[PDB]
Amino acid sequence: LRSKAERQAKLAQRKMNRMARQGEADRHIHASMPKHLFSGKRTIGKTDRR
Amino acid sequence: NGKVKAGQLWSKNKEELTKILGELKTELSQLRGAKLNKIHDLRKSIARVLTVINAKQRAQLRLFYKNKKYLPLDLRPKLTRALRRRLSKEDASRVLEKTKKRLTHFPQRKYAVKA
Amino acid sequence: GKAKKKGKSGAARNYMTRTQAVKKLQLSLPDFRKLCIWKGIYPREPRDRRKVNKSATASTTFYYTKDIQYLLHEPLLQKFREQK
């Protein structure tokens, strides 16, 4: 029963290991399409980045 | 062992109930496999003894305040706040004297109409 | 480790003067004298009068605080107020 228990614990980690999370506390959702990179236009005056 | 039944508790008067509570709390404090079952049984026994003591004390207080005008707030009926603030039945059914005379001499009659 | 003031503790709580006792009991002096005579309350003398009251005299009379509280619990006060 113990061996079955750690086997279940190890099989519970497969999706987060494929997502390459550092443990089960790694639940950060990053900005894949940030607004500052995907909106607005660049003029001759002040720009938002160099 | 360590289990005290409520039916045994209900027959006992106040002072030996306090004695039994004292022994239960004392042996629990000395206890602080089968010890887990024993401490669980001690906890539930203490809960039962406290319940029985509280119930008997409240019964005595109700008997004491049975014929007094003002009761303690915990012994007063709960109902709701609005039900407590509602007019009493006697005051709500109280009626003026002219209306009383009218209802005395001309009430709603039982009648039928021939077809 | 809390700092403590001087006049708060000790004989200052243990004894109170006749003026303070009368003002605490909310009484006139004749009523206070009658109550003291009946209950058996007598002044007593503190070890150090300056410890109890800062402006204290050989003339002034101190009383026991528990005696004053026992006079407070005395039920003759309600009779006095009713008769007044």
Partner: protein, 97 residues
């Protein structure tokens, strides 16, 4: 002539509860009849003539009987509502008929 320039969709009243409301009214009528039995479920109403020149050809039921009508029929005004007769003190009898 379409009056749909306000926020009319906020106060559209449908009437899918028409059969349910009819059933509710019938149940209330049964309860009232059972409570008032053996009395009739309604009061006695007079015969009055409709006002205006359009409707004065037709008679209908009024609110209640006048005090002069009750006095001429010999029923006291305090007994009359207690035996199923509606009483109306505002109406007058301007004509004999």
């Amino acid at each position: 002539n379409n009056h749909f320039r306000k926020h009319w969709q906020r106060r559209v009243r449908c009437h899918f509860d028409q059969p349910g409301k009819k059933v509710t009214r019938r149940l209330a009528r049964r309860a009232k009849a059972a409570a008032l039995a053996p009395r009739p479920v309604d009061k006695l109403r007079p015969i009055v003539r409709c006002p205006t020149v359009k409707y004065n050809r037709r008679t209908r039921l009024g609110r209640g009987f006048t005090l002069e009508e009750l006095k001429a029929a010999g029923i006291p005004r305090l007994l009359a509502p207690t035996i199923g007769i509606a009483v109306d003190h505002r109406r007058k009898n301007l004509s004999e008929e």
